Symmetry: D2
């Protein structure tokens, strides 16, 4: 009758609690996986669920080590289950989802979910999000779509999905290309699938890696200090992502530091602090002249994911641009 | 019998050009204020326009010296004109508009305007933008609303307005509280005004300042380096704004560096990389314990503006939090 | 000492139920106001609540009689309570809210609330919505803002608020002018108030009315039948609202019928089926010539509310247009 | 070595003019196809353009006869050109686009385009809109995606695309599933394609039809008259689409009239006035019990298109539901 679904838990508000149902204060990742699952008894109606705790952190402390652990656990356990759900904080779910989207080689459903309200709160969103994530992970139509995020009755691809609001339960949106499908009464009408290459159609293989190249992010604004970019350069960072103003534009002092870094081997990706649309070529910056790479619709944090992985294969800026055009 | 409107030009793509109407490439600041005005002769039908070129730069290079020049100029010439229009780049127009919103003591109309397509482009947006900006600055109903941005037939308050898309003509949106008015056929239906204190209702007086407090911005993401934050501390920054994940949260190592900076005198404001919603008190971070200030709906670059101005009066976190609750 | 808040219950999904927490099927009309109050014991911490069941219906069956009951009851009982919450279906909440916004003379807080998920749903939104609505009604800052809708942690004015999505908990938005305030941890930051005249600043007085003028709505689209329009004219309707295409345009057949209906004393308002933006004058329809009124930002169902009240005082198109310009 | 592109002109503002650059008044369908092409000399860099005038109307007067003309012309001429662009009014572009999406059996690019500003107006959108539409028609990657709409640098599928704002140049959005691609510097990065069946994958064949089944639309609101519904049933309409309240709900007297109509043969689809989201099954309305069909994400004007074409083939409500599940 029912699919075997593995829940890999990482913490987040979905496993987090406070002293009151009406007070906003909470602490993240106190609740273990077994307690989350038992708190939604209806999951037994749609899946045989096995829970495993990988870590128990707030996703604001998410890191490369947890990413390597998840990618390897999924790639190892692919043939032992029918699909995966990862419980995770909201704050960096959009980064973990895109990392997994590029490094998981299982094309069974892999679904991430979180909660914007603590499990102890009035009208807690976590129970029904988990229910719907398992509905998604259990649906054979979810296979081959890449890694997914299921939040607020919506299935979102891992590349485009991002947090649009600090607090709203409806915060996760695919702000450039839209969602893949909507969940109603336990059924999904998929109308889209991401054309960017994911999972088994990428060359990225972290099976034998215990660390990732070092990539930092710098912000642009009026009168922006070069000290952030200089500090990453002085530490020998492999790459730097610019959170540019407008269409990936650089403050004078930041342009100058990043131009000199790119000349000496630092991979430099222009992204934007602006929440939708592409950082394009052919605007005000001659990328080929400086050795810069344009991020396209990848926001800074998503550009960092792809750049880190691109640096596992190449330091050539032409080849990194080709990777930013395909993944 | 028409109003006297002064145009203060600072450059931007509105004044910019490329070598083809169809290709996207361009350079800012190729067109001076007199050519810009003369190219829109319909302005003569609604105002008597005088143009002064204040600077000629891309707004990616906007800085404190241009802010101080603009505030002092508008404050000095308030009694000589009926209204102001400031032509500016799009990329940091939301920063400049908020600075002027807090330091301009002239409650006559002050309206900022730019363009997403260069002046040479097919279907250039600059002309009708500039026209709508003068309509707005000529409308007696625009006075006392604080500094405004006029873009795509819409009147936006300087505090909430932000660039939502890298390339779209419709990019400027007041994403939290909505616009003030819509322009149709040179008439505005104003249904809103900003409740936060602006212009003559703020204590910020830059009339005798030649420099502003040093405030930098650090980005949060998975595995974030503390190095950028350490570099700003080590340089003696007066303040640091954090572009937090989710509801203004910080990666572990950034948290530890900013907690220590706040303890030892650095002003620290938690904002969010998330494009809409407040960074709130009473969530995961005990602000009162660390001496941190929560930015509310101010995005990192806007939080920087207010923190620079707060630091001209106080270094006390309870008093900076009061400022972030009123302006 | 906690404020006295009266809940006037009308039914809705918030008082709706189905057979299962996970199945989407539900019914309304079954569940009493004391059950909603019991789902939210935390109410006792913020107010002295008294519940009255006025009717128990799905708001898809909302009607003139319920509106008149509600306005008269709020106006009679104003000096007996400190604020009102109205529990109501989602589907026509934007119509009731605007009727009450025009007809209520009580300037104490009047807050409507519903739920997008039935009370029986996993992660039901009704409990926290109702809590936040009582917060809003208890907030002295909520007085003098007109009639409010509180949904998904957001305070929305009764004029601009509309249901944007069929199923999403985040459906309610003030799509043209934006919300008034956001609610976090039981506190509101109000940054806006509606400039259009409401409540005690309107001349609409239904205290002695037992019915309202008959006003119907016709839809425009390719090849539209004039029959719906001709049926309302033939039944001697007092007014017709057109849900126009684009900027309130009319299919040729519908134009002809409405042009005739206006000449024989039917009031005709052009609104739009487009969900945001004004139906303007000075576009493709000469309203003055035909005796039509342009709805501005009022959508068809909101235009019907103001037209019905306009017709309690005048049948003159110029006077109705002025009313559509002020309320 | 350029593609041959045929422009089929139907009228619209994009061919429309007013008495000034600066007043909003205009009349639609003045200029001819040859004047439109000559305004955009740049088209010669990207295509060999041939224009034909099919009609010269405001799209507010679009009708079944124009739709049958357009479908047959495209189907006959498919082998004579590399791609089609259709110039059209904005108001009903979303209807013609979906009709052609179901009935066109040419899988070469078919692209619709319009303009929200008059050709004579300052910063007219029409010229760069046509340029971009010809870019899209000439892109071999546009084939096999169904009939497209190109507006504001965006490629939108003919099923989801809708006019979201009355006046904004950015009005056209695919509000449920998002755009297919974005156009920058005359290039398109496609990242999506519609999964719903279109063009050569639909059984709809209009090649021999001179008429379409009669399908009318009724609007729901508080106190809705049943008289529009009764007028269509008395005229012996083949189908009726309900613009329902919320999730496709009906006012009681409309429900009763349409339940009776459905039992006696009339095909009834529940759609929604709400601008986004699906009208679902398994909510408050037992569709199978009344013989009703749920429209899904199809809005009322889009639901009419598909119900007209379904009625060319079947009047069985079960089979019509299957059609609403597949196209
Ligand atoms: N800070 C928490 C927030 C939550 O999950 O809503 C996290 O990302 O783990
Ligand atoms: N009424 C015009 C509107 C426009 O095209 O902007 C039309 O659809 O023909």
């Amino acid at each position: 009758h029912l699919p075997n679904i593995t829940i890999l838990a990482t913490g987040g508000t979905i496993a987090g609690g406070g002293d009151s149902a009406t007070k906003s204060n909470y602490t993240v990742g106190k609740v273990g996986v077994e307690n989350l699952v038992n708190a939604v008894p209806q999951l037994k109606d749609i899946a045989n669920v096995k829970g495993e705790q990988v870590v128990n952190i707030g996703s604001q402390d998410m890191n490369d080590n947890v990413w390597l652990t998840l990618a390897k656990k999924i790639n190892t356990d692919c043939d032992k289950t029918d699909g995966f759900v990862i419980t995770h904080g909201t704050d960096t779910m959009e980064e973990t989802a895109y990392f997994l989207d590029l490094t998981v080689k299982c094309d069974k459903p892999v679904v991430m979910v979180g909660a914007m309200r603590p499990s102890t709160s009035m009208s807690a969103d976590g129970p029904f999000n988990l229910y719907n994530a398992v509905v998604t992970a259990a649906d054979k139509a979810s296979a081959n779509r890449g890694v997914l995020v299921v939040m607020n009755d919506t299935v979102l691809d891992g590349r485009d999905v991002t947090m649009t609001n600090t607090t709203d339960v409806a915060t996760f949106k695919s702000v450039n290309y839209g969602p893949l499908g909507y969940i109603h009464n336990g059924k999904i009408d998929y109308q889209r699938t991401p054309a960017r290459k994911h999972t088994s159609d990428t060359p990225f293989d972290v099976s034998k890696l215990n660390e990732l190249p070092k990539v930092g992010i710098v912000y642009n604004y009026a009168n922006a200090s070069d000290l952030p970019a200089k500090a990453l350069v002085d530490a020998g960072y492999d790459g730097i992502v610019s959170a540019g103003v407008g269409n990936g534009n650089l403050y004078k002092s930041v342009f100058d530091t990043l131009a000199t870094a790119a000349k000496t081997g630092t991979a430099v990706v222009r992204s934007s602090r602006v929440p939708t649309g592409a950082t394009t070529q052919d605007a005000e910056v001659d990328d080929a002249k400086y050795g810069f790479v344009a991020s396209g619709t990848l926001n800074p944090q998503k550009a960092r994911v792809l750049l880190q992985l691109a640096l596992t294969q190449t330091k050539d800026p032409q080849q990194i641009q080709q990777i930013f055009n395909q993944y």
